């Protein structure tokens, strides 16, 4: 019921700016400051709803129609920049994590939000864990802790100590992976209760930035991709038959006699059907990759500012990416008057290996 | 606090087999900034109103 791919194509007259060189769909009424995070609704919700958090302290929700029309639906406010957002598996709740040191649970139908988590520093990551025996929210913070919350009591149901400040995380039950400052990298198992499973010597020599878990042929979490500030991504299997050959890195988000410019990898997401992946970078490009054949499927034209975040909708028929300054060159290159965009693309067949 | 020190991209080397020079276009690649993430530096600047 409806189109698999429906945005169509923008035309230029038969007979001028670099904000949208792919001419992707532009989300209506975009946030007023840089976008930190994007998250699409789970398959339990009919239709597609997008959440974005920004450095103006707001979280916004849009309905995304098959045609590419986007309708603003609702918004909530933190008192500091929103660093991460996610959904409950039933699609009723959006969870939000902020520099104000808290996380909120936002019930969309009643448009009410309440605090569900507290840290002693900014909350960098937030995920919903649905296990057979329990359900909880996991938060990771620059206070060097990982905490787990039932959403009802203000006491955490568990507190795990991290080796350093939480920089990124992902969860696909029964696996969680967390990357920290000083190249810390830890995999957790989540069966019965969360516990540390393996501390991994980083496959990357530079500051960790983003991470996404991928699944094997049986649909079980089996590895993750990890991006650094140094235009490189590691593909890392948990238990491969030949680690020295099966685990590998590849270069990306570089430009180019003259020196090659190296940019940060800001986001990484796997296509939920094809198991291929998208990366987005401080170079203002997105790339699509096949980690099995070890190929690049596509690189975008270059935007006039960094791409700060990306995600797929539940079936991967829509790829969303945010055009926002990422502070990669510090405050001197922040232009508070330059517009922020969320762009949408029907990229499913671009992500399907031939 | 924040990004008071001017940005200057660290130079380096790699190969592609040809030897290449590189410039790292990320502030946290600088020695002065290596102990913090982009988000931590940004929050510091926001708090100090150095936008």
Swiss-Prot record, chain A:
The modification Phosphothreonine is found at residue 222. Transmembrane segments: none annotated. Keywords: Cell cycle, Cell division, Cytoplasm, Cytoskeleton, Host-virus interaction, Mitosis, Nucleus, Phosphoprotein, Repeat, Transport, WD repeat. GO terms for biological process: cell division; mRNA export from nucleus; nucleocytoplasmic transport; regulation of mitotic spindle organization; RNA export from nucleus; transcription-dependent tethering of RNA polymerase II gene DNA at nuclear periphery. The keyword Zinc-finger does not apply. It comes from the Eukaryota. Residues 12-27 are annotated as: Disordered. It is found in: Cytoplasm; Nucleus; Cytoplasm, Cytoskeleton, Spindle pole; Nucleus envelope. Coiled coil: none annotated. WD repeats lie at residues 30-72, 77-107, 118-150, 161-199, 208-248, 260-290, 299-335. One of its GO terms (cellular component) is nucleoplasm. GO terms for molecular function: microtubule binding; RNA binding; ubiquitin binding. Belongs to the WD repeat rae1 family. Interacts with NUMA1 (via N-terminal end of the coiled-coil domain); this interaction promotes spindle formation in mitosis. Interacts with NUP98. Interacts with MYCBP2. Interacts with USP11. Acts as a mRNA export factor involved in nucleocytoplasmic transport. Plays a role in mitotic bipolar spindle formation. May function in attaching cytoplasmic mRNPs to the cytoskeleton both directly or indirectly. This is mRNA export factor RAE1. It comes from Homo sapiens (Human). The gene is RAE1.
From Swiss-Prot, chain B:
It comes from Homo sapiens. Residues 1-51 are annotated as: GLEBS. This is Nuclear pore complex protein Nup98.
